[model samples]
Target: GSMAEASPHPGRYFCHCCSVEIVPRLPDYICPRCESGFIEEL
Candidate 1:
């Protein structure tokens, strides 16, 4: 099994347009569902 590691900006991300929650690879994660929406930590 792999162990979990702590990150600098740790949190689940979502977009204002779709409200779709997901774990982003980077802090600058953008919404795939909507190109206009930028994902933010929640």
Candidate 2:
């Protein structure tokens, strides 16, 4: 994704199966909310 005009943290993402938001991509991950193994994006 494009960076904000002056975003400090670059960018972040979220998951639909949970209420998590951050920048840590991988083949699979743990949903900070539901603790699943699928993190789409915000």
TM-score of each model, paired residue for residue: 0.41, 0.33
Predictions: Cα RMSD each: 5.8, 5.2
lDDT of 2: 0.53
The local distance difference test score of each candidate is 0.60, 0.53
Return the TM-score for candidate 1, rounded to 2 decimals: 0.41
Candidate 2 colliding pairs: 14-42
Give per-residue CA lDDT, model 1, range 1-42, as digits (tens).
Answer: 122544554556787777788566454465655654467766
Kindly report which residue stretches of model 2 are placed more than 4 angstroms away from their true locations once superposed.
Answer: 1-11, 19-28
Model 1 sits at a Cα RMSD from the real structure of 5.8
